[PDB]
Design a protein around this ligand. Structure first.
Ligand SMILES: O=c1[nH]c(=O)c2nn[nH]c2[nH]1
Ligand SMILES: O=c1[nH]c(=O)c2nn[nH]c2[nH]1
Ligand SMILES: O=c1[nH]c(=O)c2nn[nH]c2[nH]1
Ligand SMILES: O=c1[nH]c(=O)c2nn[nH]c2[nH]1
Ligand SMILES: [Cl-]
Ligand SMILES: [Cl-]
Ligand SMILES: [Cl-]
Ligand SMILES: [Cl-]
Ligand SMILES: [Cl-]
Ligand SMILES: [Cl-]
Ligand SMILES: [Cl-]
Ligand SMILES: [Cl-]
Ligand SMILES: [Cl-]
Ligand SMILES: [Cl-]
Ligand SMILES: [Cl-]
Ligand SMILES: [Cl-]
Lengths: 298, 299, 300, 300
């Protein structure tokens, strides 16, 4: 074996979990954006791996310094714009960069309120689904922006079943038309190259679509015949209501809530006491894209 | 070569940990959930299972789990405090070999979903903005004592915080500061003693409100904190002033310092614009205050 | 709170009916034919709303039945005047159906005129002449008065002078010049109440009110009469009707105007001395006034 | 006997400018945005000297109303027709002390941006009337500024899951009971926000439209049985009130068209609900206004 028999399929490096708070003051009123940033590069050469020559390597320490400098100089209007600014900086500054990817997630600080009055400078951590984004670009290619929400845990106590599935000698699952639907969601969507809109406004709108499609209307809900169908309802709601979304990926990790058999304990459990099964757990995942966007890619 | 005769049993305790279940209640089409994690521990009047390999008096931890689930079905859960009381009372009445029972309960923070201000009949979202818990305990022929609390409560203010005039010595490099970020993860636990005649949910919400308001100060100007320790005291004194049911209050503040990154070498000036949190190592302070009247009554 | 129920909600109004019931009533006196072609709308409010609130139709009179009743009454009673026919329809509903809380009948005439050859009326031939559509309206609530209104709409009148608009309120957004000699062109909606009085010749009084509107609009035929605004012309019409027609208790007049602009033709190398005028159809001005006799208003 | 001003009461005086049509164009670089509207603004003045005395001193010309609408569109832009109607009413109330009352009605021209291969066109539009959006704002001196929004000329049809049975029977009722007809309705829907203006007008208008379509239709896989036009109106209103707390009062008018299964027996074939002929006149109407008890009590 020698270097000549071996092909480099991929080389990538970067700085992970760069944590900082960007503070902005309008007189007495304070605004915060706390983020965690990961920035990864692929270089046009691999001399650092193949030859022990570091000449082209931008230290990961420099990646961190650049992220902090851009936050200071530019501020953070949206994590998407900040991710774009970082990718653009790397592409326009370093000719040895073949590819840049920036991942950002928001720390979910909310302003405190007292009797409906917003506090000028006090905040509470409220994780109701983590906001993230991702920007990436190859040399001479498009800068593509994705946004998402993860660690989003939703549960409805009825309007859920799973019936009429494939049966075989190892299938013991009963048909059910009235279970708890409990899901941890990862949702990620692509804007492609479109960046003419309010990133915060569209992110909020997509989140609203996910919750409403999951839940159905507040007065009656909507029957889910499978986790898979609920994923589809979420994706089709987003695509129907948010033209900026070109491609949407949803992953639902479910937890079954078992109605505990209490016969042997001398009472009847009419869907009163339910025990969650956290492992093993089921998952389903789907990615839908607009035909017109995918054809335009070719 | 040591025998039972050379050795003293100082403590023996056992139990069931992380009993997880959802209690579902339906009022027509409107669904209500209480999902909890329960730990119930017992001390028995004897230690034959340890000393002699004799299990005659041991209540299986499996039976502890069965009892918790049966009581949830039969009684429901009006509040986790009432459920913890019901579990402790059940063990003390039912089993004469129980010397002591302690029940710890924490709520899974499900919130009802709203669409355009309309509450959803049966859909919920997980929102961990401080975990509600309680603890009930009782020794044979002693009082059943109930505590409630909130933990993993993370609060931050961006100003009205300093730490000055502290003790200096040859290993003290900390500068005096009058304008830092105050970021704290709070554990708060309070005792009601034996009083259980009031709305547990209403009082818990009121104590939480006092913690947030005392931490923050008024929304138009805030309030200067001269230390983490003083902020803990302000929280405790606010709760005791506004919530007569609270006899004893413990607060633990785990802080994170946010450093203003020196950017001189990167050719720019950072005027408290970019701050980097230090998560480890981290400072902690803890205080427990009690009402003199309640502590004297204990004697 | 997840949905509203009937308990959180007030029914402010529930009304239904049949609209644009079109028919011709033909009457023959030997060879001589008489026509009355009408368009009828009849609306009911019922004493309950179970059809809306509960999906229960037990008390609902089908709108198809409303149509049948209007056609049957036209056959049985004839149409002496649209007002008497509207009265007959309201009375039928109130006396027949205990579930009717309120009835309103609106009728308009199709404006057929008999053809004339050298002043001789044709026995059976007619021409459509829409020079102001005649209508009426009768309504009654259970245990209340049956009230009759008559009117004329789509009446378009124009005079070429004796019209101005001067001395109006001026402000930074007011560019309108003062004018003392413009075209006054108005499309009129006129509606008047007789209240409960129905002892007179409906056709005769309707014709008299129409005559008053035309004469008050126009002024005397040898000189006319100066109008200082659309609003003043509306008042002159209303005060003429009230002066000459005692049966009219309350009168509503709506004037939708069209301004005729004297085209500036300077750039086209000629002078337009109020010779060529271009109507502005949108946007358009409107004014509306309702006057009532103090005696009638006090009495109710 | 000639009547004088002393015998007569002025019950109502109102005037205004109707059908003010314009397009507001906004450019963000190459990308063009349009809002084309039709505005009517009406005033009641604190005096009626223009009618009673031929004195125009207090009259704001309708031409000035038009100028103000155009000036406000230029200065403010149009984020929503509701905000524009608010801006017009506020301008009149705060500018003219002789104004007792202002009402502004606005409807949108339904321009939609063109798309090619999923790509929105920077500056090209097509007219797509799928229900006309309108709003109405009004205010009396020292009274609340009240905003209403609506959709009209909205024509919806389902081909089954509709009947009308169990209705009141009488000697003039020939309508057969039916459990499987076409339900075809032209809807006028208007709702009041009262004084609440803390929400996104465009977002809530779209949400109310969605409620109307979904309540009319039922779920797309099975639909929902309608036992009357009246019950369908109620389902629409109760869906909107359940889902849209901002709606205080909702009025729905359903004008229906019956589709008759043509009897083709004499033409030698059987028509099994294959060929249906719409009856456009006469036509049935039903109308309901529901209000929240809390809002109506707060008014008194
Ligand atoms: O909705 C469901 N989808 C599945 O794929 C599945 N497998 N077990 N239960 C299930 N429920
Ligand atoms: O508020 C503070 N208390 C302390 O005890 C401390 N120690 N370092 N910084 C500190 N700040
Ligand atoms: O007679 C008129 N009345 C009005 O109110 C008006 N407004 N513009 N022109 C007008 N002329
Ligand atoms: O649904 C209906 N409502 C009515 O009131 C009616 N009248 N005729 N047909 C009708 N259908
Ligand atoms: Cl808060
Ligand atoms: Cl929510
Ligand atoms: Cl500092
Ligand atoms: Cl005290
Ligand atoms: Cl009723
Ligand atoms: Cl003729
Ligand atoms: Cl002129
Ligand atoms: Cl004439
Ligand atoms: Cl006269
Ligand atoms: Cl006056
Ligand atoms: Cl209101
Ligand atoms: Cl209500």
């Amino acid at each position: 074996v020698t270097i000549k028999d071996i092909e480099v399929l991929n080389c990538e490096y970067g700085k992970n979990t760069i944590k900082f708070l960007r503070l902005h003051r309008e007189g007495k009123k304070h605004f915060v954006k706390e983020v965690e940033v990961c920035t990864h590069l692929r270089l046009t050469s691999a001399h650092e791996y193949l030859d022990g020559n570091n000449s082209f390597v931008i230290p990961t320490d420099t990646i961190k310094n650049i992220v902090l400098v851009l936050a200071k100089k530019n501020g953070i209007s949206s994590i998407e714009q900040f991710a774009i600014d970082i990718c653009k900086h790397f592409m326009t500054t370093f000719c040895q960069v073949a590819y840049v990817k920036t991942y950002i997630q928001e720390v979910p600080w909310q302003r405190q309120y007292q009797n409906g009055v917003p506090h000028i400078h006090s905040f509470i951590l409220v994780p109701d689904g983590i906001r993230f984004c991702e920007a990436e670009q190859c040399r001479n290619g498009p800068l593509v922006v994705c946004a998402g929400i993860k660690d989003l845990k939703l549960m409805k106590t009825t309007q859920s079943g799973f019936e009429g599935f494939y049966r075989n000698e190892h299938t013991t699952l009963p048909e059910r038309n009235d279970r708890i639907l409990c899901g941890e969601f990862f949702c990620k969507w692509s804007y492609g190259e479109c960046r003419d809109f309010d990133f915060d406004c569209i992110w909020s709108k997509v989140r609203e679509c996910i919750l409403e499609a999951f839940s159905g209307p507040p007065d009656c809900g909507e029957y889910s015949p499978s986790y898979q169908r609920t994923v589809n309802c979420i994706q089709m709601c987003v695509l129907s209501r948010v033209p900026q979304v070109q491609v949407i990926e949803v992953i639902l990790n479910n937890n079954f809530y078992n109605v505990v058999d209490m016969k042997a304990l001398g009472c009847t459990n009419d869907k009163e006491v339910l025990v969650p099964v956290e492992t093993p757990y089921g998952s389903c995942a789907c990615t839908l894209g607009r035909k017109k966007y995918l054809e335009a890619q070719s």
